[PDB]
Design a protein around this ligand. Structure first.
Ligand SMILES: CC(C)(COP(=O)(O)OP(=O)(O)OC[C@H]1O[C@@H](n2cnc3c(N)ncnc32)[C@H](O)[C@@H]1OP(=O)(O)O)[C@@H](O)C(=O)NCCC(=O)NCCS
Ligand SMILES: CC(C)(COP(=O)(O)OP(=O)(O)OC[C@H]1O[C@@H](n2cnc3c(N)ncnc32)[C@H](O)[C@@H]1OP(=O)(O)O)[C@@H](O)C(=O)NCCC(=O)NCCS
Ligand SMILES: CC(C)(COP(=O)(O)OP(=O)(O)OC[C@H]1O[C@@H](n2cnc3c(N)ncnc32)[C@H](O)[C@@H]1OP(=O)(O)O)[C@@H](O)C(=O)NCCC(=O)NCCS
Lengths: 275, 272, 275
């Protein structure tokens, strides 16, 4: 339902309900309680009840739930849990491959849907998936895509293929008028330098945030998404020269036209200093 | 209709009519007189009149005009100016988002249309846009695309996104049988090394030229687009070994088959 | 229909029939005898007859044939040769731009078709081409695409454009359920280091092998495609932890979730191991 930015969406599996408050206290903009791929078949019924217990016992909590996809016998049970607790403000639909799967999850839960693209089928149908009623924003399942397309995760070639999927997510986001999408999970938990590089790369591309998997990732993500002093000072220089009214001028040796001035004004506004 | 290469298309705003002769004298293959985003709203009526007088006073001049798009109240006056002066040999259509917008601009002006792809919407509809009657060639609005898709212009990530959009311009160019497209503006006016590299990259990719924004960029663009001595000597060597007519051979340690021989002959003929 | 991996498909022109045995003795997974663009128009009739003796004289030989496409007058004669010799196990269809071209080459020969994408039209129609009856797998003509799209072969910009065609082959391979595709020819015959790099790049991206053009290319292709000791030992460590428990865990500092465990298990199975 939002058009605002989500910087961080932190997974926590419903098998570890004691970790859900820790996820919420981490400062992440969103917490995702997982009922799907982090939870083994045998623990999924218990985990669903764990999540029900947490939501009842923590009525002020607001969380996303990654539900089992329609193939699973627990699909309707996941959707009903989303529907029946005000603490569930949206669901992640994994393995999404059709507008129909989005519509069914949205109507059944009555809550916003985050489609997670993790397969070639999802990419091929992303136009209709993004355009489906109930979609809040799109996110990426990088490791799922590497499995589906047989990519060597982390190599230059895999990242080039994933660049094609990221582009599609960013294109359809603007085509369907969705809220800012989230780039995929960065799995090297303690590699802050690599996490920082994944975040800046994602932000530079128009992603609003990242799915994440450990509370320690939250602080690097939020600091990296902030405009640097240099980006702020550039935009101030561009906005100053543009205040008189001129159509085209020069700043730092570069021509500045309407699109450049607009980017500079939006950068300043998004950091808390509009006109 | 015109399917020649345009190496350089130099913008000049109609607010600076004394600069229009300067732009034509730069040697650019095309001059674009701008009535759109380089011209403040308050100056657009005066600027259109500046352009009218330039065209009337300079009848041998042939120029492109960037008009305001249909949403702007001055759209019809821009189209009329394009229609009524023989010196206007084509128009740039900004923020192009549908075949219908091209068809209307072409019918109204009776002149070739240069769609400028500057948005995700334009990209989504580029198949129909490129195929529309009246299209001469496509050009890339990199800075507009960066605004529309919220890209950090100049970063590695932004250029990767821009690479995907350039591909669509290059693909649809070939599919619709258009003239060679133009890559986007390089804004760092005095950075010749950076400008030289953007041009080589664009050419290597199948672009025929660049939109440009300062007369000083024209000579660097034109020289960088020239085939180097090394490329020409390679093409001549490939042209020898292929003159006998033999099926497949080797040059410089590389297999040469029919497409390589074809590529070499086209390089030599485009160089005279 | 074959869904095994072909690591190497070695071209040899039917004008050099003495070289066809050398091509097979090289160990390539497939030999492609060319009747099309490597053979001068004036030699195509004799070349077809050269290929005819070779199959007659060598009945245990199994080869692919690159035929002349539909408007060349020898098309039907090429198809009859493919149809009538058990040694022809498939054909490469050059200049493919439609599903109908695939269907007609498939039914006429009764043999599996490898569509070879060499033009922008072929790319734009690749959804239909790959889904066509008779398709075994895809490959492309990288040099042909460079001609058709006016690319400076070998430059970074050209490889960026070819990256879009590689993505398309890989996307449609998975959508149509085809066998692993082959990346394009690497033409610098003796540059093993460069050939090794193109192979690593192709495999990391999900290609099963490469078209090649000289016997000396085969051993480098085959050696580069096998998983490294490091990849195997990593996959062994990941699989061990995935039996020891259930759910998400960490290996080498990285989170391992269901797709990562799946990828590690797939690598071990393809190399003949397990766990
Ligand atoms: C990867 C993971 C299993 C690591 O768990 P671990 O090895 O036990 O964690 P560490 O020892 O590194 O850190 C544990 C500490 O952080 C907390 N923690 C770790 N991961 C957490 C998470 N995702 N949410 C909340 N708290 C978490 C633990 O409660 C503990 O705090 P404590 O010391 O007060 O008990 C864990 O981060 C996790 O479950 N996240 C993955 C999210 C997921 O479901 N992934 C699938 C979608 S891609
Ligand atoms: C030219 C520009 C750098 C601003 O002007 P500027 O800062 O005064 O230019 P400079 O001082 O560096 O150079 C000035 C000299 O080059 C001339 N000239 C400069 N830019 C010119 C241009 N686009 N077209 C024609 N002539 C130009 C000037 O007349 C002057 O020559 P002079 O001394 O003989 O009078 C640039 O911002 C511009 O106007 N670009 C045109 C782009 C446009 O119209 N739209 C942008 C679409 S992306
Ligand atoms: C490119 C090509 C002409 C080079 O031939 P060349 O210059 O004679 O190559 P070399 O001198 O290095 O040959 C060395 C040895 O390999 C053999 N050889 C070379 N290319 C061969 C091939 N494609 N198949 C089988 N044997 C081959 C030669 O016969 C020679 O063995 P020999 O000493 O026993 O006679 C040759 O590799 C070829 O025809 N292949 C290209 C594939 C093709 O059809 N092209 C179009 C597809 S993109």
């Amino acid at each position: 339902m939002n058009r605002q930015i989500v910087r961080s969406a932190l997974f926590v599996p419903a098998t570890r309900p004691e970790r859900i408050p820790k996820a919420l206290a981490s400062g992440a903009d969103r917490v995702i309680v997982d009922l799907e791929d982090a939870v083994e078949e045998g623990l999924k019924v218990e985990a669903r009840a764990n999540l029900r217990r947490f939501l009842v016992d923590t009525p002020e909590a607001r969380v996303l739930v990654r539900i089992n996809a329609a193939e699973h016998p627990g699909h309707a049970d996941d959707l009903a849990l989303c529907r029946d607790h005000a603490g569930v403000i949206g669901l992640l639909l994994p393995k999404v491959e059709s507008a129909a799967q989005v519509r069914h999850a949205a109507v059944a839960s009555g809550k916003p849907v985050w489609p997670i693209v993790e397969s070639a089928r999802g990419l091929a149908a992303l136009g209709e998936i993004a355009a489906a009623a109930g979609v809040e924003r799109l996110s990426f399942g990088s490791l799922d895509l590497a499995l589906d397309l047989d990519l060597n995760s982390g190599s230059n070639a895999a990242e080039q293929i994933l660049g094609h999927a990221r582009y599609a997510l960013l294109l359809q986001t603007r085509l369907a008028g969705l809220a800012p999408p989230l780039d995929g999970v960065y799995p090297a938990i303690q590699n802050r330098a690599g996490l920082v590089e994944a975040v800046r790369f994602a932000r530079d591309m128009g992603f609003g945030g990242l799915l994440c998997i450990h509370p320690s990732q939250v602080e690097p993500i939020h600091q990296t998404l902030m405009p640097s002093p240099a980006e702020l000072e550039w935009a101030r220089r561009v906005a100053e020269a543009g205040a008189s009214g001129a159509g085209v001028f020069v700043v730092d040796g570069e021509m500045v036209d309407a699109p450049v001035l607009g980017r500079a004004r939006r950068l300043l506004e998004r950091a808390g200093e509009g006109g």
